[PDB]
């Protein structure tokens, strides 16, 4: 009766390891598109249903490389997901959310037959770390008709996104690039009281967390985009009522529950 339910009854172990379908990627190269710097798509197969799309910005200096296994991790639980490279290495957060917007135009009008297969393009997301995680919150304040945005350990010199999209950020307590307390925790702060949003800090984790396979990123990320995607409620139970000695910090309006 829900339509976009995807997969079996989740287990909190089953989602720190890949899901049960299986990936293919697609290389875009960077003169192959308008508004961003090409990258890698994820996208399931063995499969008739489409899925909802999510697209994922890297940080300053990095490539999709840095952000590879959780886009695989994420398609393989049922996503069609693209991870960006940006125009350039240095381009800042309100650039990489400009580059985002591009490239999810991309995925729902030019991206190859097998990706639009799998794709329903009125279910999109948006994800990503540090500067990537900045544009993830502008592009959810531009955007409201996105589903949902996790920017990952975020980084931003503006504070405050107006935005309706529901928000889960990760935070890193050991982070000294964008320490919580200046980045992920005002940015929680100043979203809209209305907006559901939830704020959950990695215990003694660095700003290079969401670059390796990390078990708590893998559970909150794919929790958030199975909630709000595919409006898939048998996930609230990872974002509601939660134990995890992972998490040293949680914050939450429990608009999701």
């Known amino acids: 009766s829900n339509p976009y339910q995807r997969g079996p009854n989740p287990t909190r172990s089953a989602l720190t390891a890949d899901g049960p379908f299986s990936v293919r990627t697609y290389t875009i190269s960077r003169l192959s598109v308008s508004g961003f710097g090409g990258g890698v798509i994820y996208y399931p197969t063995g499969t008739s249903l489409t899925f909802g799309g999510i697209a994922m910005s890297p940080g300053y200096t990095a490539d999709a490389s840095s952000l590879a296994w959780l886009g695989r991790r994420l398609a393989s639980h049922g996503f069609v997901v693209l991870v960006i490279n940006t125009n350039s290495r240095f381009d800042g957060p ?133 909630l709000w995607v595919d409006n898939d409620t048998r996930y609230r139970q990872f974002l509601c009522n939660v134990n995890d000695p992972a998490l040293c910090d949680f914050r939450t309006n429990n608009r999701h529950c």
């Open 94 to 226: 309100d650039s990489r959310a400009s580059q985002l917007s591009a490239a999810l135009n991309y995925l729902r009008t030019s991206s190859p037959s097998a990706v639009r297969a799998r794709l329903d393009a009125n279910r999109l997301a948006v994800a990503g770390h540090s500067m990537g995680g900045g544009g993830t919150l502008r592009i959810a304040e531009q955007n409201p008709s996105l589903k949902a945005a996790v920017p990952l350990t975020p980084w931003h010199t503006d504070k405050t996104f107006n935005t309706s999209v529901p928000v889960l950020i990760v935070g890193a307590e050991a982070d000294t690039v964008a320490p919580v307390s200046q980045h992920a925790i005002p940015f929680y702060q100043n979203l809209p009281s209305t907006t559901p949003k939830v704020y959950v800090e990695l215990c003694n984790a660095s700003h290079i967390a969401p670059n390796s396979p990390n078990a708590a990123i893998s559970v909150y990320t794919i929790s958030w985009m199975k």
